[PDB]
Protein backbone atom coordinates (compact mmCIF):
# COMPACT_ATOMS: atom_id res chain seq x y z
CA UNK A 1 0.00 0.00 0.00
CA UNK A 2 0.89 3.72 -0.25
CA UNK A 3 0.51 5.99 -3.28
CA UNK A 4 3.28 8.09 -4.68
CA UNK A 5 3.77 10.43 -7.64
CA UNK A 6 5.86 7.86 -9.47
CA UNK A 7 7.90 8.32 -12.60
CA UNK A 8 8.93 5.57 -15.02
CA UNK A 9 12.46 4.19 -14.49
CA UNK A 10 14.65 6.52 -16.59
CA UNK A 11 17.53 4.27 -17.63
CA UNK A 12 16.31 3.63 -21.17
CA UNK A 13 16.04 7.38 -21.77
CA UNK A 14 19.33 8.26 -20.01
CA UNK A 15 21.00 6.09 -22.66
CA UNK A 16 19.67 8.47 -25.33
CA UNK A 17 20.71 11.84 -23.96
CA UNK A 18 23.39 13.83 -25.73
CA UNK A 19 24.63 17.43 -25.74
CA UNK A 20 24.08 19.53 -28.86
CA UNK A 21 25.96 22.79 -29.36
CA UNK A 22 25.54 25.23 -32.20
CA UNK A 23 27.82 28.22 -31.96
CA UNK A 24 27.34 29.56 -28.44
CA UNK A 25 24.05 27.72 -27.67
CA UNK A 26 24.13 24.34 -25.93
CA UNK A 27 21.17 22.18 -25.07
CA UNK A 28 20.13 18.53 -24.93
CA UNK A 29 19.39 16.17 -27.75
CA UNK A 30 17.74 12.77 -27.98
CA UNK A 31 19.80 10.17 -29.90
CA UNK A 32 17.68 7.32 -31.39
CA UNK A 33 19.15 5.11 -34.09
CA UNK A 34 21.33 7.49 -36.20
CA UNK A 35 19.30 10.65 -35.56
CA UNK A 36 19.68 13.25 -32.84
CA UNK A 37 16.51 15.30 -32.21
CA UNK A 38 16.73 18.72 -30.53
CA UNK A 39 14.89 22.06 -30.35
CA UNK A 40 15.53 24.14 -33.47
CA UNK A 41 16.31 27.16 -31.28
CA UNK A 42 19.77 25.59 -30.70
CA UNK A 43 20.71 27.68 -33.81
CA UNK A 44 19.71 30.96 -32.18
CA UNK A 45 21.59 33.46 -30.16
CA UNK A 46 19.56 35.09 -27.32
CA UNK A 47 19.22 38.14 -29.65
CA UNK A 48 17.80 35.88 -32.42
CA UNK A 49 14.99 34.66 -30.10
CA UNK A 50 13.23 38.05 -30.27
CA UNK A 51 12.24 37.58 -33.92
CA UNK A 52 13.78 34.42 -35.41
CA UNK A 53 13.39 33.32 -39.03
CA UNK A 54 14.45 29.75 -38.52
CA UNK A 55 14.70 28.89 -42.22
CA UNK A 56 17.00 31.86 -42.77
CA UNK A 57 19.10 31.18 -39.68
CA UNK A 58 19.40 27.53 -40.59
CA UNK A 59 20.85 28.41 -44.06
CA UNK A 60 23.92 29.79 -42.27
CA UNK A 61 24.57 26.43 -40.54
CA UNK A 62 26.34 23.38 -41.98
CA UNK A 63 26.59 19.83 -40.52
CA UNK A 64 29.98 20.73 -38.92
CA UNK A 65 28.34 23.61 -37.01
CA UNK A 66 26.30 21.11 -34.90
CA UNK A 67 28.50 19.61 -32.19
CA UNK A 68 27.00 16.48 -30.70
CA UNK A 69 28.67 14.84 -27.76
CA UNK A 70 27.48 11.52 -26.23
CA UNK A 71 29.23 11.01 -22.91
CA UNK A 72 32.70 12.38 -23.57
CA UNK A 73 32.82 11.35 -27.25
CA UNK A 74 31.95 13.38 -30.30
CA UNK A 75 29.45 12.17 -32.88
CA UNK A 76 29.91 12.97 -36.56
CA UNK A 77 27.01 14.91 -38.11
CA UNK A 78 26.35 13.83 -41.68
CA UNK A 79 23.01 15.56 -42.27
CA UNK A 80 20.60 18.03 -40.76
CA UNK A 81 17.00 18.95 -41.35
CA UNK A 82 14.28 20.93 -39.68
CA UNK A 83 10.91 19.29 -39.00
CA UNK A 84 8.49 21.84 -37.57
CA UNK A 85 10.25 23.11 -34.38
CA UNK A 86 12.82 20.32 -34.08
CA UNK A 87 16.10 19.68 -35.78
CA UNK A 88 17.01 16.18 -36.82
CA UNK A 89 20.78 15.72 -36.96
CA UNK A 90 21.80 12.57 -38.83
CA UNK A 91 24.90 11.07 -37.29
CA UNK A 92 27.22 8.39 -38.65
CA UNK A 93 26.69 6.08 -35.66
CA UNK A 94 23.51 4.43 -34.47
CA UNK A 95 22.99 4.78 -30.74
CA UNK A 96 23.91 1.38 -29.40
CA UNK A 97 21.57 1.95 -26.43
CA UNK A 98 18.53 2.80 -28.59
CA UNK A 99 15.51 1.25 -26.86
CA UNK A 100 12.34 0.10 -28.64
CA UNK A 101 10.51 3.38 -29.19
CA UNK A 102 7.61 5.26 -30.65
CA UNK A 103 6.75 8.91 -31.08
CA UNK A 104 3.36 9.75 -29.67
CA UNK A 105 1.35 12.97 -29.40
CA UNK A 106 -0.57 12.99 -26.11
CA UNK A 107 -3.84 14.66 -25.21
CA UNK A 108 -4.40 17.05 -22.27
CA UNK A 109 -4.76 15.20 -19.03
CA UNK A 110 -2.21 12.52 -19.96
CA UNK A 111 0.73 12.07 -17.69
CA UNK A 112 4.35 11.34 -18.52
CA UNK A 113 7.78 11.26 -16.92
CA UNK A 114 10.38 13.94 -17.65
CA UNK A 115 14.12 13.31 -17.50
CA UNK A 116 15.44 16.83 -16.83
CA UNK A 117 18.92 17.18 -18.35
CA UNK A 118 21.67 19.78 -18.67
CA UNK A 119 24.63 19.50 -21.05
CA UNK A 120 23.42 16.08 -22.16
CA UNK A 121 23.55 14.82 -18.55
CA UNK A 122 20.61 13.67 -16.42
CA UNK A 123 19.76 15.67 -13.35
CA UNK A 124 16.45 14.14 -12.29
CA UNK A 125 13.16 12.51 -13.09
CA UNK A 126 9.67 13.65 -12.27
CA UNK A 127 6.16 12.97 -13.24
CA UNK A 128 3.78 15.51 -14.72
CA UNK A 129 0.72 15.99 -16.92
CA UNK A 130 -0.11 17.78 -20.13
CA UNK A 131 -2.37 20.53 -18.68
CA UNK A 132 -5.75 21.29 -20.32
CA UNK A 133 -4.20 24.61 -21.51
CA UNK A 134 -1.31 22.64 -23.20
CA UNK A 135 1.38 23.77 -20.76
CA UNK A 136 3.30 21.56 -18.34
CA UNK A 137 4.27 22.56 -14.83
CA UNK A 138 7.84 21.26 -14.83
CA UNK A 139 11.13 22.09 -13.14
CA UNK A 140 13.43 23.39 -15.80
CA UNK A 141 16.29 25.87 -15.89
CA UNK A 142 18.17 27.45 -18.83
CA UNK A 143 19.94 24.64 -20.63
CA UNK A 144 17.16 22.11 -19.93
CA UNK A 145 15.81 22.45 -23.48
CA UNK A 146 15.70 19.19 -25.35
CA UNK A 147 14.91 17.23 -22.13
CA UNK A 148 12.14 14.75 -22.98
CA UNK A 149 8.89 13.39 -21.62
CA UNK A 150 7.93 9.78 -22.09
CA UNK A 151 5.90 6.78 -21.01
CA UNK A 152 7.00 3.13 -21.06
CA UNK A 153 5.00 0.00 -21.95
CA UNK A 154 7.22 -2.96 -20.82
CA UNK A 155 10.26 -2.39 -23.11
CA UNK A 156 8.88 0.28 -25.49
CA UNK A 157 9.49 3.95 -24.78
CA UNK A 158 6.84 6.29 -26.14
CA UNK A 159 8.35 9.75 -26.34
CA UNK A 160 5.70 12.44 -26.13
CA UNK A 161 7.40 15.69 -25.21
CA UNK A 162 10.55 17.68 -25.85
CA UNK A 163 11.08 20.78 -23.72
CA UNK A 164 11.48 24.08 -25.62
CA UNK A 165 10.67 26.99 -23.39
CA UNK A 166 9.44 28.69 -20.32
CA UNK A 167 6.57 31.13 -20.82
CA UNK A 168 6.76 34.58 -19.20
CA UNK A 169 4.45 33.13 -16.47
CA UNK A 170 6.88 30.38 -15.40
CA UNK A 171 5.01 27.41 -16.92
CA UNK A 172 6.49 25.26 -19.67
CA UNK A 173 5.89 24.65 -23.35
CA UNK A 174 7.21 22.14 -25.79
CA UNK A 175 6.59 19.87 -28.70
CA UNK A 176 5.99 16.26 -29.61
CA UNK A 177 8.96 14.47 -31.29
CA UNK A 178 7.66 15.59 -34.69
CA UNK A 179 8.38 19.15 -33.59
CA UNK A 180 4.76 20.31 -33.27
CA UNK A 181 4.09 22.39 -30.20
CA UNK A 182 1.44 21.38 -27.75
CA UNK A 183 -1.00 24.25 -27.69
CA UNK A 184 -0.65 27.55 -29.50
CA UNK A 185 2.87 28.32 -28.40
CA UNK A 186 5.73 29.41 -30.63
CA UNK A 187 9.47 29.26 -30.14
CA UNK A 188 9.82 33.06 -30.03
CA UNK A 189 10.34 35.61 -27.23
CA UNK A 190 6.89 37.13 -27.63
CA UNK A 191 3.64 37.59 -25.62
CA UNK A 192 2.21 34.15 -25.04
CA UNK A 193 -0.32 33.97 -22.24
CA UNK A 194 -1.75 30.61 -21.25
CA UNK A 195 -5.45 29.79 -21.12
CA UNK A 196 -7.31 28.50 -18.06
CA UNK A 197 -5.53 25.74 -16.29
CA UNK A 198 -8.54 23.64 -15.38
CA UNK A 199 -8.45 20.60 -13.13
CA UNK A 200 -8.41 17.19 -14.87
CA UNK A 201 -11.56 15.69 -13.41
CA UNK A 202 -11.16 12.11 -14.58
CA UNK A 203 -7.67 12.07 -12.96
CA UNK A 204 -9.01 13.44 -9.66
CA UNK A 205 -11.61 10.66 -9.65
CA UNK A 206 -8.88 8.09 -10.38
CA UNK A 207 -6.87 9.43 -7.45
CA UNK A 208 -9.95 9.27 -5.13
CA UNK A 209 -10.23 5.57 -6.16
CA UNK A 210 -6.49 5.19 -5.33
CA UNK A 211 -7.25 6.81 -1.93
CA UNK A 212 -10.05 4.25 -1.26
CA UNK A 213 -7.81 1.33 -2.33
CA UNK A 214 -5.10 2.58 0.02
CA UNK A 215 -7.63 3.03 2.95
CA UNK A 216 -8.22 6.78 2.95
CA UNK A 217 -11.99 6.66 2.89
CA UNK A 218 -13.23 9.60 5.05
CA UNK A 219 -14.54 11.58 2.05
CA UNK A 220 -16.94 8.88 0.85
CA UNK A 221 -20.44 10.17 1.35
CA UNK A 222 -23.96 8.71 1.17
CA UNK A 223 -24.82 10.51 -2.10
CA UNK A 224 -24.92 9.95 -5.82
CA UNK A 225 -25.31 12.38 -8.73
CA UNK A 226 -25.72 12.36 -12.52
CA UNK A 227 -23.19 13.41 -15.15
CA UNK A 228 -25.18 16.56 -15.90
CA UNK A 229 -25.54 17.55 -12.24
CA UNK A 230 -21.88 16.81 -11.53
CA UNK A 231 -20.76 18.81 -14.57
CA UNK A 232 -22.73 21.87 -13.45
CA UNK A 233 -20.58 21.81 -10.28
CA UNK A 234 -17.37 20.91 -12.18
CA UNK A 235 -17.87 23.94 -14.46
CA UNK A 236 -18.29 26.21 -11.41
CA UNK A 237 -15.00 24.94 -9.93
CA UNK A 238 -12.96 25.10 -13.18
CA UNK A 239 -12.87 21.32 -13.48
CA UNK A 240 -12.99 19.75 -16.95
CA UNK A 241 -16.37 18.26 -17.99
CA UNK A 242 -16.67 14.56 -17.26
CA UNK A 243 -17.86 12.54 -20.22
CA UNK A 244 -19.28 9.02 -20.56
CA UNK A 245 -15.87 8.09 -22.10
CA UNK A 246 -14.28 9.15 -18.75
CA UNK A 247 -16.85 7.07 -16.83
CA UNK A 248 -15.96 4.07 -19.00
CA UNK A 249 -12.23 4.57 -18.41
CA UNK A 250 -12.89 4.55 -14.65
CA UNK A 251 -14.78 1.21 -14.88
CA UNK A 252 -11.82 -0.96 -13.70
CA UNK A 253 -11.38 1.22 -10.58
CA UNK A 254 -15.14 1.23 -9.95
CA UNK A 255 -15.12 -2.58 -10.22
CA UNK A 256 -12.10 -2.98 -7.94
CA UNK A 257 -13.56 -0.79 -5.17
CA UNK A 258 -17.28 -1.49 -5.67
CA UNK A 259 -17.93 2.30 -5.78
CA UNK A 260 -20.02 3.40 -8.77
CA UNK A 261 -18.40 6.20 -10.76
CA UNK A 262 -21.35 8.52 -10.16
CA UNK A 263 -21.17 7.89 -6.40
CA UNK A 264 -17.49 8.93 -6.49
CA UNK A 265 -18.56 12.00 -8.52
CA UNK A 266 -20.97 12.83 -5.70
CA UNK A 267 -18.17 12.53 -3.15
CA UNK A 268 -15.99 14.81 -5.30
CA UNK A 269 -18.93 17.30 -5.64
CA UNK A 270 -19.16 17.46 -1.83
CA UNK A 271 -15.36 17.95 -1.49
CA UNK A 272 -15.54 20.86 -3.93
CA UNK A 273 -18.49 22.45 -2.11
CA UNK A 274 -17.43 21.77 1.50
CA UNK A 275 -13.63 21.92 1.10
CA UNK A 276 -11.26 19.57 2.94
CA UNK A 277 -11.90 21.10 6.40
CA UNK A 278 -8.18 20.75 7.20
CA UNK A 279 -8.10 17.07 6.36
CA UNK A 280 -5.88 15.28 3.82
CA UNK A 281 -6.36 12.53 1.21
CA UNK A 282 -3.23 10.46 0.42
CA UNK A 283 -1.19 13.11 2.25
CA UNK A 284 -2.51 15.94 0.09
CA UNK A 285 -4.60 18.91 1.17
CA UNK A 286 -5.71 19.51 -2.42
CA UNK A 287 -7.30 17.17 -4.93
CA UNK A 288 -4.52 15.69 -7.10
CA UNK A 289 -5.04 15.54 -10.83
CA UNK A 290 -1.77 14.27 -12.26
CA UNK A 291 -2.61 10.53 -12.00
CA UNK A 292 -4.58 9.05 -14.86
CA UNK A 293 -6.87 6.06 -14.34
CA UNK A 294 -4.21 3.89 -16.07
CA UNK A 295 -1.55 5.24 -13.68
CA UNK A 296 -3.66 4.26 -10.70
CA UNK A 297 -4.18 0.73 -12.04
CA UNK A 298 -0.51 0.43 -12.96
CA UNK A 299 0.78 1.59 -9.58
CA UNK A 300 -1.78 -0.34 -7.55
CA UNK A 301 -0.99 -3.59 -9.48
CA UNK A 302 2.84 -3.33 -9.65
CA UNK A 303 3.33 -3.33 -13.43
CA UNK A 304 7.03 -3.59 -14.42
CA UNK B 305 11.79 27.85 -12.82
CA UNK B 306 9.26 25.42 -11.30
CA UNK B 307 9.81 23.01 -8.41
CA UNK B 308 9.05 19.34 -8.56
CA UNK B 309 9.42 16.34 -6.27
CA UNK B 310 12.34 15.01 -8.29
CA UNK B 311 14.02 11.65 -8.04
CA UNK B 312 17.56 10.83 -9.14
CA UNK B 313 17.85 9.25 -12.62
CA UNK B 314 17.47 5.51 -11.92
CA UNK B 315 19.53 3.91 -14.68
CA UNK B 316 22.58 3.13 -12.55
CA UNK B 317 20.37 1.32 -10.04
CA UNK B 318 18.21 -0.45 -12.67
CA UNK B 319 21.45 -2.10 -13.82
CA UNK B 320 21.76 -3.69 -10.36
CA UNK B 321 18.31 -5.19 -9.87
CA UNK B 322 17.90 -8.94 -9.85
CA UNK B 323 15.25 -11.44 -8.76
CA UNK B 324 16.00 -13.70 -5.79
CA UNK B 325 13.87 -16.77 -5.10
CA UNK B 326 14.18 -19.12 -2.17
CA UNK B 327 11.69 -21.94 -2.24
CA UNK B 328 8.32 -20.29 -2.79
CA UNK B 329 9.38 -16.71 -1.84
CA UNK B 330 10.54 -14.30 -4.55
CA UNK B 331 11.74 -10.77 -4.05
CA UNK B 332 14.32 -8.32 -5.37
CA UNK B 333 18.03 -8.27 -4.85
CA UNK B 334 20.75 -5.70 -5.44
CA UNK B 335 23.75 -7.04 -7.42
CA UNK B 336 27.00 -5.07 -6.80
CA UNK B 337 30.32 -6.59 -7.80
CA UNK B 338 29.92 -10.36 -7.06
CA UNK B 339 27.42 -9.99 -4.21
CA UNK B 340 23.63 -9.94 -4.30
CA UNK B 341 22.04 -8.28 -1.25
CA UNK B 342 18.42 -9.05 -0.32
CA UNK B 343 16.10 -9.15 2.71
CA UNK B 344 16.75 -12.24 4.83
CA UNK B 345 13.01 -12.95 4.94
CA UNK B 346 13.40 -14.38 1.39
CA UNK B 347 14.01 -17.68 3.29
CA UNK B 348 10.65 -17.55 5.04
CA UNK B 349 7.29 -18.91 4.15
CA UNK B 350 4.33 -16.66 5.16
CA UNK B 351 3.83 -19.06 8.14
CA UNK B 352 7.51 -18.55 9.17
CA UNK B 353 7.00 -14.75 9.41
CA UNK B 354 4.88 -15.11 12.57
CA UNK B 355 7.86 -16.20 14.69
CA UNK B 356 11.00 -16.68 12.56
CA UNK B 357 14.35 -17.88 13.90
CA UNK B 358 16.42 -16.75 10.97
CA UNK B 359 19.60 -18.57 12.03
CA UNK B 360 17.68 -21.83 12.29
CA UNK B 361 15.80 -21.32 9.03
CA UNK B 362 19.00 -20.38 7.24
CA UNK B 363 20.67 -23.70 8.30
CA UNK B 364 18.16 -25.52 6.08
CA UNK B 365 19.26 -23.53 3.00
CA UNK B 366 22.26 -24.19 0.76
CA UNK B 367 23.74 -21.98 -2.03
CA UNK B 368 21.67 -23.90 -4.65
CA UNK B 369 18.44 -23.00 -2.80
CA UNK B 370 18.91 -19.28 -3.71
CA UNK B 371 17.88 -18.68 -7.31
CA UNK B 372 19.18 -15.40 -8.65
CA UNK B 373 18.13 -14.24 -12.07
CA UNK B 374 19.51 -11.07 -13.75
CA UNK B 375 17.39 -10.27 -16.78
CA UNK B 376 16.56 -13.70 -18.17
CA UNK B 377 19.86 -15.33 -17.12
CA UNK B 378 20.64 -17.29 -14.00
CA UNK B 379 23.54 -16.39 -11.73
CA UNK B 380 25.51 -19.08 -9.92
CA UNK B 381 25.48 -18.75 -6.12
CA UNK B 382 28.81 -19.74 -4.60
CA UNK B 383 28.31 -18.48 -1.05
CA UNK B 384 25.72 -17.06 1.30
CA UNK B 385 25.81 -15.25 4.59
CA UNK B 386 23.49 -13.30 6.81
CA UNK B 387 24.49 -9.82 7.97
CA UNK B 388 21.90 -8.46 10.40
CA UNK B 389 18.60 -8.54 8.39
CA UNK B 390 20.13 -8.94 4.94
CA UNK B 391 21.47 -11.90 3.07
CA UNK B 392 24.59 -11.54 0.99
CA UNK B 393 24.68 -14.08 -1.84
CA UNK B 394 28.13 -14.40 -3.41
CA UNK B 395 27.82 -15.09 -7.11
CA UNK B 396 30.45 -16.26 -9.57
CA UNK B 397 30.04 -13.22 -11.84
CA UNK B 398 30.66 -9.58 -11.05
CA UNK B 399 27.86 -7.34 -12.21
CA UNK B 400 29.24 -5.72 -15.33
CA UNK B 401 26.96 -2.71 -14.74
CA UNK B 402 28.16 -2.11 -11.15
CA UNK B 403 28.32 1.67 -10.68
CA UNK B 404 30.67 3.45 -8.26
CA UNK B 405 28.90 2.97 -4.94
CA UNK B 406 28.85 3.38 -1.21
CA UNK B 407 26.65 2.12 1.58
CA UNK B 408 25.38 4.90 3.77
CA UNK B 409 23.10 5.02 6.81
CA UNK B 410 20.96 8.18 6.65
CA UNK B 411 19.44 10.23 9.45
CA UNK B 412 15.75 11.16 9.79
CA UNK B 413 14.82 14.01 7.55
CA UNK B 414 17.13 12.90 4.73
CA UNK B 415 15.59 12.26 1.38
CA UNK B 416 16.35 9.58 -1.18
CA UNK B 417 14.98 8.06 -4.36
CA UNK B 418 13.36 4.62 -4.39
CA UNK B 419 13.36 2.34 -7.42
CA UNK B 420 10.27 0.19 -6.73
CA UNK B 421 10.77 -3.27 -8.28
CA UNK B 422 8.91 -6.55 -8.65
CA UNK B 423 10.50 -9.81 -9.77
CA UNK B 424 13.81 -8.03 -10.28
CA UNK B 425 12.15 -5.58 -12.72
CA UNK B 426 11.75 -1.83 -12.27
CA UNK B 427 8.26 -0.45 -12.00
CA UNK B 428 8.90 3.16 -10.99
CA UNK B 429 10.92 5.78 -9.21
CA UNK B 430 9.85 8.19 -6.52
CA UNK B 431 11.34 10.45 -3.98
CA UNK B 432 10.79 10.18 -0.25
CA UNK B 433 12.28 10.93 3.17
CA UNK B 434 13.33 8.96 6.20
CA UNK B 435 10.58 10.12 8.62
CA UNK B 436 11.51 11.27 12.16
CA UNK B 437 9.84 8.03 13.42
CA UNK B 438 12.16 5.95 11.10
CA UNK B 439 9.40 4.87 8.72
CA UNK B 440 9.10 5.83 5.05
CA UNK B 441 5.84 6.60 3.31
CA UNK B 442 6.43 4.66 0.09
CA UNK B 443 4.36 2.89 -2.54
CA UNK B 444 5.09 -0.77 -2.22
CA UNK B 445 3.14 -3.97 -2.82
CA UNK B 446 3.91 -7.61 -1.94
CA UNK B 447 7.00 -8.58 -3.88
CA UNK B 448 8.56 -5.09 -3.63
CA UNK B 449 10.93 -6.23 -0.87
CA UNK B 450 14.55 -5.71 -1.71
CA UNK B 451 13.76 -2.51 -3.71
CA UNK B 452 16.36 0.10 -2.73
CA UNK B 453 16.66 3.75 -1.82
CA UNK B 454 19.63 5.80 -2.90
CA UNK B 455 21.19 9.17 -3.60
CA UNK B 456 23.70 10.00 -6.35
CA UNK B 457 26.72 12.34 -6.25
CA UNK B 458 27.82 12.71 -9.94
CA UNK B 459 28.75 9.06 -10.70
CA UNK B 460 28.65 7.54 -7.18
CA UNK B 461 25.50 5.84 -5.94
CA UNK B 462 25.04 5.92 -2.18
CA UNK B 463 22.60 3.19 -1.26
CA UNK B 464 20.79 3.97 1.97
CA UNK B 465 17.69 1.81 2.13
CA UNK B 466 16.44 -1.66 1.30
CA UNK B 467 12.70 -2.26 1.65
CA UNK B 468 11.67 -5.06 4.03
CA UNK B 469 8.12 -4.58 5.16
CA UNK B 470 4.88 -2.80 5.55
CA UNK B 471 3.77 -2.14 9.12
CA UNK B 472 0.17 -2.94 10.12
CA UNK B 473 -0.51 0.84 9.70
CA UNK B 474 0.47 0.93 6.01
CA UNK B 475 3.81 2.76 6.40
CA UNK B 476 7.12 1.18 5.45
CA UNK B 477 10.19 -0.13 7.23
CA UNK B 478 13.55 -1.27 6.05
CA UNK B 479 17.25 -1.39 6.58
CA UNK B 480 20.49 0.15 5.45
CA UNK B 481 22.67 -2.06 3.16
CA UNK B 482 24.38 -3.50 6.25
CA UNK B 483 21.02 -5.01 7.18
CA UNK B 484 20.31 -2.79 10.20
CA UNK B 485 16.74 -1.58 10.40
CA UNK B 486 15.99 2.08 10.58
CA UNK B 487 14.14 2.56 13.83
CA UNK B 488 13.04 -0.16 16.22
CA UNK B 489 11.40 -2.40 13.66
CA UNK B 490 11.94 -6.13 13.28
CA UNK B 491 11.35 -8.44 10.35
CA UNK B 492 8.55 -10.33 12.13
CA UNK B 493 4.74 -10.31 11.86
CA UNK B 494 4.26 -8.77 15.30
CA UNK B 495 2.82 -5.59 16.90
CA UNK B 496 4.99 -2.71 15.76
CA UNK B 497 3.38 0.68 16.15
CA UNK B 498 5.19 3.74 14.86
CA UNK B 499 6.02 6.80 16.95
CA UNK B 500 4.96 10.36 16.15
CA UNK B 501 5.51 11.32 12.58
CA UNK B 502 6.63 14.88 13.12
CA UNK B 503 7.20 17.41 10.37
CA UNK B 504 10.83 17.97 9.28
CA UNK B 505 11.15 21.66 10.00
CA UNK B 506 14.47 22.35 8.30
CA UNK B 507 13.04 20.79 5.09
CA UNK B 508 9.88 22.92 5.27
CA UNK B 509 12.08 26.01 5.56
CA UNK B 510 14.16 24.83 2.58
CA UNK B 511 10.98 24.41 0.56
CA UNK B 512 9.74 27.92 1.56
CA UNK B 513 13.10 29.23 0.22
CA UNK B 514 12.45 27.21 -3.00
CA UNK B 515 8.99 28.87 -3.14
CA UNK B 516 10.59 32.37 -2.89
CA UNK B 517 13.19 31.51 -5.55
CA UNK B 518 10.42 30.31 -7.85
CA UNK B 519 8.28 33.50 -7.18
CA UNK B 520 5.68 32.23 -4.72
CA UNK B 521 6.15 34.92 -2.11
CA UNK B 522 2.67 35.65 -0.64
CA UNK B 523 3.50 34.05 2.74
CA UNK B 524 6.47 36.31 3.51
CA UNK B 525 5.52 38.49 6.43
CA UNK B 526 7.00 41.53 8.18
CA UNK B 527 8.11 39.55 11.27
CA UNK B 528 11.11 37.84 12.74
CA UNK B 529 11.46 35.43 15.68
CA UNK B 530 14.17 33.66 17.70
CA UNK B 531 15.05 29.96 17.71
CA UNK B 532 13.53 29.55 21.16
CA UNK B 533 10.29 31.36 20.28
CA UNK B 534 9.99 29.49 16.98
CA UNK B 535 10.60 26.14 18.69
CA UNK B 536 7.82 26.77 21.22
CA UNK B 537 5.45 27.00 18.22
CA UNK B 538 7.13 24.10 16.35
CA UNK B 539 6.62 21.85 19.41
CA UNK B 540 2.92 22.79 19.54
CA UNK B 541 2.49 21.84 15.86
CA UNK B 542 4.46 18.55 16.01
CA UNK B 543 7.34 20.03 14.02
CA UNK B 544 10.89 18.92 14.85
CA UNK B 545 12.98 21.41 16.88
CA UNK B 546 15.12 23.68 14.73
CA UNK B 547 18.73 23.82 15.82
CA UNK B 548 21.59 26.22 15.05
CA UNK B 549 23.01 23.38 12.86
CA UNK B 550 19.77 23.61 10.79
CA UNK B 551 20.13 27.41 10.58
CA UNK B 552 23.69 26.95 9.30
CA UNK B 553 22.58 24.41 6.70
CA UNK B 554 20.03 26.94 5.42
CA UNK B 555 22.72 29.64 5.03
CA UNK B 556 23.16 29.17 1.23
CA UNK B 557 19.38 29.58 0.68
CA UNK B 558 19.28 32.58 3.03
CA UNK B 559 22.16 34.14 1.06
CA UNK B 560 20.57 33.43 -2.32
CA UNK B 561 17.22 34.98 -1.38
CA UNK B 562 18.40 37.65 1.08
CA UNK B 563 15.86 36.35 3.65
CA UNK B 564 17.36 35.70 7.09
CA UNK B 565 16.64 32.21 8.39
CA UNK B 566 14.84 33.58 11.46
CA UNK B 567 12.64 35.79 9.26
CA UNK B 568 11.62 32.67 7.29
CA UNK B 569 10.97 30.94 10.65
CA UNK B 570 8.63 33.81 11.50
CA UNK B 571 6.80 33.36 8.20
CA UNK B 572 6.49 29.61 8.90
CA UNK B 573 5.24 30.39 12.47
CA UNK B 574 2.48 32.56 10.97
CA UNK B 575 1.55 29.84 8.42
CA UNK B 576 1.21 27.33 11.26
CA UNK B 577 -0.91 29.69 13.35
CA UNK B 578 -3.07 31.22 10.58
CA UNK B 579 -3.23 28.25 8.19
CA UNK B 580 -3.08 28.63 4.40
CA UNK B 581 -6.53 30.29 4.09
CA UNK B 582 -7.18 28.25 0.93
CA UNK B 583 -4.00 29.38 -0.76
CA UNK B 584 -1.15 27.23 -2.12
CA UNK B 585 2.66 27.39 -2.09
CA UNK B 586 4.40 25.67 -5.04
CA UNK B 587 1.06 24.04 -5.87
CA UNK B 588 0.68 22.52 -2.41
CA UNK B 589 -1.99 23.25 0.18
CA UNK B 590 0.21 21.81 2.93
CA UNK B 591 3.77 22.61 3.92
CA UNK B 592 6.08 20.13 2.17
CA UNK B 593 8.86 18.53 4.16
CA UNK B 594 10.45 16.00 1.83
CA UNK B 595 12.99 18.42 0.26
CA UNK B 596 16.23 18.91 2.15
CA UNK B 597 18.18 22.17 1.88
CA UNK B 598 20.69 20.31 -0.37
CA UNK B 599 17.82 19.13 -2.60
CA UNK B 600 16.62 22.69 -3.02
CA UNK B 601 20.09 23.91 -3.96
CA UNK B 602 20.62 20.95 -6.28
CA UNK B 603 17.31 21.36 -8.10
CA UNK B 604 17.49 25.15 -8.29
CA UNK B 605 21.07 24.99 -9.74
CA UNK B 606 20.65 22.08 -12.20
CA UNK B 607 23.26 19.67 -10.81
CA UNK B 608 23.80 16.63 -13.09
Ligand SMILES: Cc1ccncc1NC(=O)Cc1cc(Cl)cc(NCC(C)(C)C#N)c1
Nearest residue numbers: 046049140141142164165166187188189305
Ligand atom coordinates in the same frame (compact mmCIF):
# COMPACT_ATOMS: atom_id res chain seq x y z
C1 LIG C 1 15.24 29.90 -19.43
C2 LIG C 1 14.55 28.57 -19.42
C3 LIG C 1 13.99 28.07 -18.25
C4 LIG C 1 13.22 26.92 -18.30
N1 LIG C 1 12.98 26.24 -19.43
C5 LIG C 1 13.57 26.68 -20.55
C6 LIG C 1 14.35 27.83 -20.60
N2 LIG C 1 14.86 28.30 -21.83
C7 LIG C 1 14.03 28.87 -22.73
O1 LIG C 1 12.88 29.21 -22.46
C8 LIG C 1 14.61 29.04 -24.12
C9 LIG C 1 14.44 30.47 -24.59
C10 LIG C 1 13.29 30.86 -25.25
C11 LIG C 1 13.11 32.19 -25.58
CL1 LIG C 1 11.64 32.67 -26.38
C12 LIG C 1 14.05 33.15 -25.27
C13 LIG C 1 15.23 32.75 -24.65
N3 LIG C 1 16.22 33.68 -24.38
C14 LIG C 1 17.51 33.40 -23.77
C15 LIG C 1 17.63 33.81 -22.29
C16 LIG C 1 17.52 35.34 -22.17
C17 LIG C 1 18.94 33.32 -21.67
C18 LIG C 1 16.52 33.21 -21.55
N4 LIG C 1 15.63 32.73 -21.02
C19 LIG C 1 15.41 31.42 -24.30
Ligand SMILES: Cc1ccncc1NC(=O)Cc1cc(Cl)cc(NCC(C)(C)C#N)c1
Nearest residue numbers: 001350353444445446468469470491492493
Ligand atom coordinates in the same frame (compact mmCIF):
# COMPACT_ATOMS: atom_id res chain seq x y z
C1 LIG D 1 2.86 -6.97 1.73
C2 LIG D 1 3.87 -5.87 1.49
C3 LIG D 1 3.45 -4.61 1.07
C4 LIG D 1 4.37 -3.58 1.01
N1 LIG D 1 5.66 -3.72 1.32
C5 LIG D 1 6.08 -4.95 1.66
C6 LIG D 1 5.23 -6.04 1.76
N2 LIG D 1 5.71 -7.28 2.23
C7 LIG D 1 6.02 -7.45 3.53
O1 LIG D 1 5.69 -6.64 4.40
C8 LIG D 1 6.82 -8.69 3.86
C9 LIG D 1 6.15 -9.47 4.97
C10 LIG D 1 6.45 -9.19 6.30
C11 LIG D 1 5.75 -9.84 7.30
CL1 LIG D 1 6.11 -9.45 8.96
C12 LIG D 1 4.77 -10.77 7.02
C13 LIG D 1 4.50 -11.08 5.70
N3 LIG D 1 3.57 -12.05 5.38
C14 LIG D 1 3.23 -12.50 4.05
C15 LIG D 1 1.88 -11.97 3.51
C16 LIG D 1 0.73 -12.51 4.36
C17 LIG D 1 1.68 -12.33 2.03
C18 LIG D 1 1.89 -10.51 3.62
N4 LIG D 1 1.94 -9.38 3.73
C19 LIG D 1 5.19 -10.42 4.68
